[PDB]
């Protein structure tokens, strides 16, 4: 027959949770084809849109560091030639940091990339500290050599 237990184990009674789309085939294909509860795709009903916020981000940063802008003028704080330089700077920074961090993470036997590697690279190569995300002593041979030198000096 089949052993219907008098009580089910905690795994069989779970109150399903939203699940992502895994498999690699793709989503949204109108062809001939499921979990109990899929997760709702992201959407925005009405607003500015990302295409405007992403373009205004640089002006926002410039306003932040420039100290403040008077009324009746904004946006045109950098000439066209300097904006390209800044964007190139951002791209190069991202690429270099990620490339260093991934190899550093793989060096210490890990199989995943954690924030600790990125933090270490940022601190030790660029002097940047981002808060809110969680010694050496000489050995005996050096001491003996220093003792010998000091004895020689006197």
């Amino acid at each position: 027959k089949l052993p219907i237990p008098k009580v089910l184990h905690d795994k069989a009674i779970q109150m399903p949770q939203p699940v992502p789309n895994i498999g690699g085939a793709g989503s949204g294909r109108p062809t001939y084809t499921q979990p109990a509860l899929p997760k709702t795709p992201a959407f925005q009903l009405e607003g500015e849109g990302e295409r405007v916020l992403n373009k205004k981000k640089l002006d926002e940063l410039v306003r932040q560091v420039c100290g403040g802008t008077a009324e009746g003028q904004d946006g045109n704080m950098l000439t066209p030639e300097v904006e390209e330089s800044v964007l190139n700077m951002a791209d190069a920074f991202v690429d270099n940091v990620l490339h260093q961090a991934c190899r550093n993470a793989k060096e210490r036997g890990s199989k995943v990339l954690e924030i600790r590697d990125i933090q270490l690279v940022l601190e030790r190569v660029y002097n940047i500290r981002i808060p809110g995300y969680a010694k050496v002593q000489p050995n005996s041979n050096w001491i003996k050599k220093m003792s010998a030198v000091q004895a020689a000096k006197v």
Partner: protein, 69 residues
């Protein structure tokens, strides 16, 4: 014959576990089949097999309950 070699099944276990964060009836069937194979070779207790089968049955019932009457 591909499922007789120890290395081959150890390999397939990784793929089965990789596709298990989005459980579906077919994936649960594959997991239960792997559990049966493990039990056959004295690498698992019958209790774990029964638990796996119970989870599969519960998911199948839940999917049956979502269709038109």
């Amino acid at each position: 014959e591909y499922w007789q070699n120890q290395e081959n099944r150890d390999q397939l276990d990784t793929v089965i576990k990789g596709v298990m964060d989005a459980p579906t009836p077919r994936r649960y069937f594959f997991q239960a089949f792997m559990s049966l194979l493990k039990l056959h070779n004295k690498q698992e207790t019958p209790q774990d097999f029964n638990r796996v089968v119970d989870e599969a049955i519960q998911l199948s019932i839940r999917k049956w309950h979502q269709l038109p009457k």
